[PDB]
Design a protein that fits this description.
This is part of a larger assembly, with five copies of chain A.
Chain A (H helix, E strand, L loop, with lengths): L1 E5 L7 H4 L6 H12 L4 E5 L1 H10 L6 H7 L1 E2 L8 E3 H28 L8 H16 L7 H13 L2 E3 L4 H9 L2 E2 L5 H7 L1
Parallel strand pairs in A: 1-2, 1-5, 2-3, 5-6
Helix pairs in contact in A: 3-7, 5-6, 7-8
Bound molecules: magnesium ion (4 copies).
The structure holds one RNA strand.
Protein name (chains A, B, C, D): RNA-free ribonuclease P
Pfam family, one (chains A, B, C, D): PIN_5
GO biological process, one term (chains A, B, C, D): tRNA 5'-leader removal
RNA sequence: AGGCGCGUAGCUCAGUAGGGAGAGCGCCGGCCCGACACGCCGGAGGUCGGGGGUUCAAGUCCCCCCGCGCCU
């Protein structure tokens, strides 16, 4: 009766998969072993599926995981989204673009007075700061769009460990859940 | 009747408005005089007009401009956009973000081998590279969305000296035009 | 009241445009002069316009052509075509694919017996046979699909000098016309 | 509850049926014996069954094969397809046709400087290159279209060793699964 | 699973040779087997009429109607695609032209023999007309009655004919092999 | 219907805990001879096949594309 759209952050972010076990290949295995007793459907987008399988390495786990989870792409030709989504997204992207320029300038001035020493450390700091400024708390990849559209079309409960995905998911129409509560709600059902 | 949607680039880009007259204000006056005798309608989004008035010294010409040209706002509440548009936009945004990160890394590495003096030239080059990498060939401001939605809603010919605006207007099916042929079109309509 | 989607062949095939004038750079001028008095709407796809302006040195006439004709791209995100248009198209392509392989083998055998000094004639014959066996009587380019969809969604009268496109336009229900009587139709409308 | 639409590649490709037994007849017999206990419905297009029976000699297997697998053709009279699918198919087909024409031109040149000796191996190389250039990675038959349409209509899990079929099925939103996992699914469901 | 029976199942010798080599024990064997298999057997009531006229069945009709079910398709609540009529019209026109050609050929061939061997010529014309206008196509209303009973019940059509399986495949209906009917019934 | 492997100077390759882009050869200067050469100083020689990603650092680690060969 209930459908759950899954994202790779469930099996990637440490804070969310610790419900089952304190190990990636143990938490995934425990999720597999008990999801077969749940009276619910599980759906994962196709793009995020191989994104997941290229991040984590599975042995005798891909067969069972494909058995319990139905991989399927959204039907991205009959789906429509409001024009207010585009406005907010483009304004947020423009706001975050200017912030990246400031960080780049600050790091190019900081490294401009070090005289060829510890420049690598400045680059390491710049990478983290720029990535956090540009790709944190927002939808950044087409995989997030795929998850959003699958949740929209299928009218399911989105289970995502991210933070920017939940914001836009609740923005459009999607019902969400706390990923820390998966092992309880999905066990009771 | 023929309806046109104007943009800032018509009076901003010199290559566009040189068909009227060499100087900006003279070209705008020529455009006003020609449009006062043309059997056609002209529109411009409210935010686009706001940025036009605060960028150009529109003195003694604002009354005539508001006379010939009608300033409107897109009705975003009753407008919907395809999902593939958002998909392509997000993919392009991610690609440009990666390009900007590469440019920032290159410029910070360059500035680390040049000591505390002459850093300003490196910063200026970093700005002129990052802005062109992240804002050329794509819709970046919320006024471009206003131009796109007003043209898509009024079924009007879009006039714009930009290149990303035309690129993303061909993606939705908006009638376009060459900005340098506008004058000859207005003298025969 | 009447919409006429145009194709490149109208200005490319000598027999089609001889109804206007004997020269390709004079027939277009006559068409623009006549279409300025016709009580009908004209349309050409964006890609078709790009291809037409690339194969013809449109100088001093492009403003006149854009004054009369409307350049617009189809909104293919909503249109649904029947599966029978795709099933009965895939078989034709596969049948033509096997024909090209036989032609290539025949020409390789024919070039292997002369063995010298005449490979150019064999190459030219292979080019012509391959082109006529895979690009004759069927829709091949993506511009033809653009014309088809623009005529379908606008419910317009297709005016194309092709035969491979006019045959598949009938398969959808598009009001086809004979391209050699465009001038008489325009002169009375 | 679950539905599986099979393709000929499941029993033809050695890398797929080796999970059953190292023998085509043995693999088919093992699949038939195992499918009699699983809680799933298997379907195959009629045009695909024709090709399957024309490539394998089934003795005492076809009566057993018809026991488990329900042969049925797609009901294509009421199955709309997206218009952008046709656009991608046309552009990719044109790309591959252009790629094969130059392959044929290269091979006729290579055979035109070798005399009447060793022409057969050149012809064989031309055949292999033409096949892999114009057929690999694309939908190239009406059997594949039947599998895709049947899977779309019944909302089933598409099983097929062909990768072009899966790649073009992902564009429509069909539940795709890895063929090599198929066996493990059957003893689990 | 539900099947749809036809006259050709019990009239064509190659079809009922699975049960017995006699068209009065094949039906008995089919009834005995169907009294054990877990399946539903349906046949249109317009098809059961032909099964009773062309075949004289006695002491077996009670068993048959006990183990088989008879119903007519509810054609008042059914729809047919519009391109079915196009294919049917084209095939009918082509077959009509072929039949006219055959009739002309058989008239010209007998116009040379004057009054001699006319009966054999007429018999040959009968056979040619039958095999050129009533083979490989739906011709009677008892064929549409089989097509619409499986289109509406989602059943596996069982028929020894060839013109039934050419148009049953054109509207997406399951198609069993008529010679294997005994085996699957044994396993179901 | 697929799986295995290779792409590094004028040619054929050695190249990895990621911390050089070189060589056996061809060979213009060189040594080497009264004398281009032999043993023997070395010029010159780059798309590490093309795009990206992760790292202070990529021929190396990770994905896509192109080309050349072996097994079904
Ligand atoms: Mg992701
Ligand atoms: Mg064309
Ligand atoms: Mg195939
Ligand atoms: Mg196939």
């Amino acid at each position: 009766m209930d459908t759950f759209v899954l994202d790779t952050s469930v099996f990637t972010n440490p804070d969310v998969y610790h419900q089952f076990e304190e190990d990636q290949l143990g938490a995934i295995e425990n999720f597999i072993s008990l999801a077969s007793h749940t009276n619910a459907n599980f759906f994962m987008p196709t793009s995020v599926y191989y994104e997941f399988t290229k991040m984590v390495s599975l042995g005798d786990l891909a067969p069972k995981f494909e058995l319990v989870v139905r991989i399927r792409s959204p039907r991205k030709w009959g789906l429509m989204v409001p024009a207010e989504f585009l406005y907010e997204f483009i304004e947020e992207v423009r706001y975050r673009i200017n912030k990246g320029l400031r960080i780049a300038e600050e790091h190019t001035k900081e490294a401009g007075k070090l005289a060829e020493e510890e420049v690598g450390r400045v680059v390491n700091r710049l990478r983290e700061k720029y990535r956090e400024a540009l790709r944190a708390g927002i939808i950044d990849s087409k995989e997030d769009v795929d998850v959003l559209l699958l949740s929209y079309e299928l009218d399911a409960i989105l289970v995502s460990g991210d933070e920017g995905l939940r914001k836009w998911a609740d923005r459009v129409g999607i019902k969400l859940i706390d990923p820390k509560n998966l092992r309880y709600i999905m066990e009771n059902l």
